[PDB]
Amino acid sequence: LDKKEGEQAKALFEKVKKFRTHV
Amino acid sequence: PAYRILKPWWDVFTDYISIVMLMIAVFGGTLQVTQDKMICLPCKWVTKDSCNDSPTGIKYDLDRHQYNYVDAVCYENRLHWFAKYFPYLVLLHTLIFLACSNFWFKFPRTSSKLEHFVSILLKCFDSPWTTRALSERTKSRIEQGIVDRSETGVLDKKEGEQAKALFEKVKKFRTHVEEGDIVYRLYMRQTIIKVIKFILIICYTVYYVHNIKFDVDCTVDIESLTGYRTYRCAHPLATLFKILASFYISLVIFYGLICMYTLWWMLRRSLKKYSFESIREESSYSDIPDVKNDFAFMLHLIDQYDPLYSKRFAVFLSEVSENKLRQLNLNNEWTLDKLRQRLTKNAQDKLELHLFMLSGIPDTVFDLVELEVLKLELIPDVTIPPSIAQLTGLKELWLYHTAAKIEAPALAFLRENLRALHIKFTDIKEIPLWIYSLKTLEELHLTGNLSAENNRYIVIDGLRELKRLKVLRLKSNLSKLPQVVTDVGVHLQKLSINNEGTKLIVLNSLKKMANLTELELIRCDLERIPHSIFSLHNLQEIDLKDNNLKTIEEIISFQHLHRLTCLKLWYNHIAYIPIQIGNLTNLERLYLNRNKIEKIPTQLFYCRKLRYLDLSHNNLTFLPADIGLLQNLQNLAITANRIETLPPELFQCRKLRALHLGNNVLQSLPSRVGELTNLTQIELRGNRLECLPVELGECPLLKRSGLVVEEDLFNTLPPEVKERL
Amino acid sequence: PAYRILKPWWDVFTDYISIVMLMIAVFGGTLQVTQDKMICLPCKWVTKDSCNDSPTGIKYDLDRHQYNYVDAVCYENRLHWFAKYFPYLVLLHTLIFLACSNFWFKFPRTSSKLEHFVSILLKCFDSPWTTRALSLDKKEGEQAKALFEKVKKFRTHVEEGDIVYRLYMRQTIIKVIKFILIICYTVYYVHNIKFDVDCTVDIESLTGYRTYRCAHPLATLFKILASFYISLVIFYGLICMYTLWWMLRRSLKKYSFESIREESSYSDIPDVKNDFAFMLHLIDQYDPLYSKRFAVFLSEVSENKLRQLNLNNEWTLDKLRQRLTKNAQDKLELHLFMLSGIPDTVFDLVELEVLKLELIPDVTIPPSIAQLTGLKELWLYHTAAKIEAPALAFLRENLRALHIKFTDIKEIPLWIYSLKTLEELHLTGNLSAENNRYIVIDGLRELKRLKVLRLKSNLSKLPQVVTDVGVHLQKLSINNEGTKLIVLNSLKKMANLTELELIRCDLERIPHSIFSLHNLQEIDLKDNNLKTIEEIISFQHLHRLTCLKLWYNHIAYIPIQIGNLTNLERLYLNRNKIEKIPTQLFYCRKLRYLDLSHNNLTFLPADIGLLQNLQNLAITANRIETLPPELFQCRKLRALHLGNNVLQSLPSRVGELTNLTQIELRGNRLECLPVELGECPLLKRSGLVVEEDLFNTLPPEVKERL
């Protein structure tokens, strides 16, 4: 992950969960 | 930027309606200019009017040219003016609706506030801090929720700085926008004028439809020029213009209905008042502001564009969010390199660190595994995050008027540590009910003023279970000491009361404890020494100072005790020493300072193991030859007493390491004291010595550190003491 | 961009009106080209009253083609002059008004001022420095500084301009002129727009009829367009007149920041009187916020703070402490050698008794000295002297010594007489007779308290301010140039003089006004042109001389009057090429320190053995043969410095003293060295400079033992 894909994927996961919850 | 502030029933429909209205104006206009012919023709059967009341043809016998003239006259001098200028009318109305809907747009007095607002709008769905913020018996002792929710993550000085800048900007931009209501006023004015023009347009245009006709009876006065008086005349475009007028009227009605909705909306609910109530209802953040002006109004307008905006903005504009941000920013800067700047030590060192200027508790401080002492001064919201587990030792913690909110789940750590705890307090209840939960606390310092009632409640519930309490210091008025003190008192080794408001009987405490291996009464308003103090068989130390104590006559029964070893009597009014003190020989310390002592009988010499004596600021003017017997004397002050030149017995001793002479009469120090060789310091001040002895060369420890002199000449020794230095 | 310099009640309206006016020209133009027909037709009635009134048809036997001719003629040389060219009158004036509006843009000598003006305002507006200035990470300093330099150069350039202001006025004026004229013409010529007109052109020879009646088909549209046009123009004119009102009832050639200055952190703003002021008013009209951000940015007070912050962010307390050293009379010596100013962090060093400043411009030392406790000594050298801090009491409680160095005359401040607690002063500098007299009066005349005074200068003559102040003088020193040895009335006035030093001064002979100074107790005469010691005979009759240094001179001869002295604790006979020493030095048995070096002695007398208290003895570079046994007939001889002499070996007996702390043996050509020397407890490689081990027994033993 080169210690950055973790952050990137995690941010996307949080956004997806909030988006999904809203939709 | 209009797109992000696009209004559902204000901009959306209006723009498409306006486009259609313009299109119909253009279509009609083009036709009106070139397709309008108005074909007229004369008629013969004229009775009253209309040329009626009647195959080869007629043969009117008129010139093709003159017919065009007739057409022009009938067109100009007849009715249906509405039809003649219908597309111009439409164009005007269309332009009015278009223009009135866009005054604010591109107009500096309004666009300025919109630009500030929009700048914020474009940051709420950006600056990742926002999305981090959006991620969300008891007895005030439980906070593991916040411990795990923060995930101990960082902002890496990026989200930190971005969010900080946005906090400065949201506060400033709001302060600017919040000053008035121009944006609000314009939208209300615009909404109302749209409705006004709508009503007028419909009334005007539905009435003048009776003007659009298949034909007209043309009765213009031109027969003297063209022969016929009455003409019948056709207007082909009239069919189409009835249709166009109808379509335009319907279009305006649609516009009107929507405009009524928007006017309806702006009146049914207050728009300036606006707060994120829905956020505190759903979210963990109850910290919701409410202002009534253009800022709130503009937020309210976009609330109906997307609720997501409101969620982002609301969590950002919060002091909860800012406080979390600040703690994270603290960690970003206040790292090990900064902590090291303050890693000092004073005495019984234990590697201290005191955090005074911080607005909260850093987490980085618990990376200082090497420290044993942490001092917190005036820091709010102290939870002590449960990441103290990486520390090994923690021998002392100072809660120096900080916060009672210690609720982190790390009592197990603290219960294996904290031999000492210091609590400074100005209030009554900022002292947490945390202390008794610690079991390994041996030493407790309580400083601040509590009433007898407060002493009883705070001590009974906050402290009573400290079975290992050995040292207790109470800097409080203590008009009564709660029974907790006497109960811990039977295991308690040291009890110290140090306050000006102390006025009480402590005899019961002294009797119950019967131990108190160290006893202190400092600034207590005492004149009388409680007689039960002599039941403390293991007293081993007693400090009676800054009292109204004016007598030592009472210390008669000290021999009831064993191993006293120390008696401090400084800053009192004991102006006289009796002959009871000579029966106290099991003493290794005696201090008589500023007590205005006029005389001391030769009694001190009996305590041949005294070794340390302070005789100062007394109107004594005398040194007995006790000094010639106490040959283990290492430290003695003879100052501020106007003693004459020191008697030779001064040097008939062995060490007298600290020779403090001053504010007396001494033309010359007996030179023979220099042969003790154990002098480490000589103070010769305010005594008017003429010269200094030249026999001090015998003592190797009078290098130029211990030579506290006024002259520093009349000698040959200066280079020796300088080289030794 | 241009938007932010557009005028709120001027330009948006001008553009919208210009657009609509052009629309009218376009509509009317097209209309005029294809719809104007002038249907005219003859009449048979009384032509004296234009065919008045005093069913089949009239017939009028004319051909259709012939009628086109009639219409054309009636159109060409009859009525409707205004209507015929109405859309062109509209187009022409509309274009003029529009061109006038945009005249100041894209103009040869306005664009450059405007472009720089806008760029600067935007940079000031969005600069974090402006925000901080409202009350740097080492980069905002550079950014703000660059903007400040650009602003100063921009302002200087614009300062000489009067173009933007004047062109705008000319433009406003011409719009008003054209406005008045267009109304006069457009409003007046409307009586020519008629539907029905009378055509009486003389074409009878071609048509038979002379009088024709005629219908202008667009009379109504031109009346409508003209009325709508006039109203557009009047509105336009209201703004044009407003502009002159605004431009004439407000100076606008000048701009003040008073309404901002009393709200913000700055006070140092000049009254702008040029095109910059005019441009400032225009942005003030758009949005005052830009006037404020600019004003906050442009401030000398702000520049001072910016620079001060740069110093504070570099010269932090750790940076200062790390570089804080001590060399002699320690007192925490902190040196700041290349700073652009003085950081505030230096005043949090409460314990910093010594501060040394050099090469620092504009030093002012803001009064935050109260934060400090000890400031016992201050060195101000080759810096600046603008310290006017209203805090003499703090300074007086401290600054026992001041060391101040100068390169010119006027650089010297007068903070000396104001500190009457001063004990010690050191002055170096460029002097002259009058320049020194004037400054020394102003500087030292009131310091009765002064005890120590040293001057490094080309003085050439001793001032009497010093001799008068000197009545309380403990220590006096002067060097690097000869002065008239004014001793006859100087030493007598000073009279205490317990330490005198004369270095590199043109002294060939010793003055004799020092001979009666029994309280001298210390005297150092070195690097002088003095080549003798003949004067020192009765000089030594004074008790307690305790020190006589005659080194670095040309005194190759020592007399035996030297035996007159019994009280001496230091004697230096260094680099004088002396060829002999008499046994007359021992008389001072308290001597303890004797320097015999760089002479041409070649031998030593039996004087050493008479000084049992000789502790420090230097015998170097004198070509002295094997040292006489008196060398070790003493009790201390802590320092035995031998070198550049001739010694085959040390006598073993000197090593039996055991009080030797160091023996220097360099350049003496020793063949060997005895073992007794290694027995001495303090010669264990303690400074024992030797060329070789010299066949000794315990050199590795003493090396390990140390």
Numbering used by the authors:
A (entry chain E): 232 to 254
B (entry chain F): 15 to 68, 94 to 175, 214 to 802
C (entry chain A): 15 to 68, 94 to 174, 232 to 802
What does the paper say about this structure?
VRAC is a ubiquitously expressed mammalian anion channel implicated in diverse physiological processes including volume regulation, cell proliferation, release of excitatory amino acids, and apoptosis. Previous studies have shown that SWELL1 is required for VRAC activity, and that the presence of other LRRC8 subunits dictates functional characteristics of VRAC, including pore properties. SWELL1 is organized as a hexameric trimer of dimers with a four-layer domain architecture and an overall jellyfish-like shape. The transmembrane (TM) and extracellular domains (ECDs) surround the central pore axis, and share a previously unappreciated structural homology with the connexin and innexin gap junction channels.
